[model samples]
Target chain A: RHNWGQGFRLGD
Target chain B: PNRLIVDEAINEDNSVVSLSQPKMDELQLFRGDTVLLKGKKRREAVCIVLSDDTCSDEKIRMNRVVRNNLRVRLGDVISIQPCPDVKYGKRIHVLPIDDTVEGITGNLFEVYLKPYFLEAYRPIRKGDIFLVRGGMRAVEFKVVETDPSPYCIVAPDTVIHCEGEPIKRE
Candidate 1:
């Protein structure tokens, strides 16, 4: 699981 | 997806997550402060405060951009300095790096997202090229569009943002 830092998923 | 680790501390035994609560208060850093990470190599990169957990007070988690710019390794200590206010203009240009339309379609935001992570002093405009790397293949792109009107407009993204209502692509 890659961490996006802000926890927002891409394309979401 | 830009679901990559932005602030994961390597060598857990030797390091901890960056930006603990107490440390932030002492440093006069707010929750959303943009900071400059300065490493031993004297290289610096701007990073935003994404987390302020109650972890170690002395260590900060270094992301790929910071680590690459600072050339620091696990157990390394870096300095933090607050950045000035940054203003981004309404205009931004984007270029599709992927070889085909499919590659370009779904991953537009992911390609240009990393640069946004860094603190900026001004808005992005005009022509600037960015790259997307994956599966040992990298594609390059240029910023060809922005919210404000420019003389030349090119390809459009699957997602259309703002009230521009899909500018003409030429």
Candidate 2:
């Protein structure tokens, strides 16, 4: 999921 | 996520991965036999909740504690616990000792874990304990008891005194 990138950047 | 965490700890850690085989001695305490739940994340626990996305079905999900984190989903079963020692109070609330649902994701840290194994460990007090990530500096909470059958999550940072030999999950 593309959200992984954003989540990784923001939350992950 | 359990909607419990507007802020919590669920991530990859540098702690040596736990690799010990399950000792049946601990399993006997369950009083009931456990059958493995199918279709779980590799090495985590089988999740038991709504396969489809829906708020109602998602309300109650079952999962296992991994390393020290909880991963909730469909088909995962947690142990039913009752503690006579738990005192009643107007504001008292019992919670799942583990949080198999907090940090579910594709990171190497989030993977398949057996649910039963998650809750079985020494000195499990309502299944709550601290798990620290040595290098990454992350902290996770695992529950030993879930009187209310729901996961309670927390994050605490502490410095370990190395007087005693450190025991890892494995």
Candidate 3:
């Protein structure tokens, strides 16, 4: 599920 | 996006990191959020973020274990970004470190791991080292693989396998 692992924003 | 690395408080969880309250807001991040950190050699660690007034705005306070996973030193800087869409892991394989398991004969799961991941919802990445203290002793485990690879949050259905031999500490 796309609820437990984390998604990150790209950083410069 | 980059912050100076600093020591965490004594007896802190390895997966926890602290940032200044204002800095957390600056990044539009909230408490209990998970952040992905990048250190040298593309090394990454996912940690829970917390607000700490004692932490400076320019620094990210974390324990030695997280630092080791990031391959960074106290004075080093690392890039951090919010990781908000993580999925529950299907499975993960971890092996205890050879050096740390010495003289330990009890079930690693019953005494060390169950309490650490159960209801803790700790996010783990492949190759990260984590510590669990139980039975009055602390045991270290190196994550060998995650079902989704790289990172995953340990949920109720996530299966943990401790197959294979103990890993030699690097």
Candidate 4:
């Protein structure tokens, strides 16, 4: 069980 | 703060902002393009178009004003170009880089600071650089703005759309 959107990412 | 003149004072239409000589005397006022401000007043302040020739002049002008006021006025410069996400269906948002603009002053040397970026573009970005050139206004210390009308850009250009999705997938 994990979250789909739980990490940070650079914006495009 | 003025009346103290050191170097030769070039009149308007002169590209020179100032010189780099470490000066004991005061500096001159800087005049750049134009910029739209925020808040209910939503006022716009003019600034000096800084260049190597006039950087020294701009610095001196700022120093003089700050010496008298005990503080400095705030301003920013911005560039708006077009960049689209590859995954999207021809959807584009103006690429406004907060760190790309060139500057002669230390405070305004970079455009990455959050406050300045927010003021320049809050909603949908204005993509193309305006064609019908307008006048420029100077305000604050080194801030400036440009009012371009009937903007259009369709030729060999520096700006290019990017290939990426808005969201990240791991």
Docking model 2 quality class: incorrect
Candidate 1 structure quality by residue, lDDT tens digits, A1-12: 311122112121
**Per-residue alpha-carbon lDDT of candidate 3 for residues B1-170, written as tens digits (9 for 90 to 100):** 65656656443887788899988999988998989999888898998898888888888888888887888888888888999877778787778999988874587766777778877778889899888888678889988888788788887778877756788988
Model 1 docking grade: incorrect
Model 2: residues with Cα > 4 Å off, grouped in runs: A1-12, B1-74, B87-129, B132-136, B139-163
Candidate 1's displacement at residue B136, Å, is 8.8
- lDDT winner, 3 or 4: 3
Tens-digit lDDT track of model 1 for B40-110: 55454444554455446666775443464456666766677655443333334445433423332444444
- Model 3 vs. true fold: TM: 0.86
User: Candidate 1: misplaced stretches above 4 Å?
Assistant: A1-12, B1-7, B10-17, B89-170
Compose the digit string of candidate 4's lDDT tens values, residues B68-90.
22122333221211122111112
**Candidate 3 residue pairs in clash (backbone atoms < 3 Å):** A4-B86, A4-B87, A5-B86, A5-B87, A6-B86, A7-B85
Best by TM-score: 3
Clashes of 2: 33
What's the true lDDT of residue B21 in model 4? 36
Ranked by TM-score from best down, the candidates are 3, 1, 2, 4
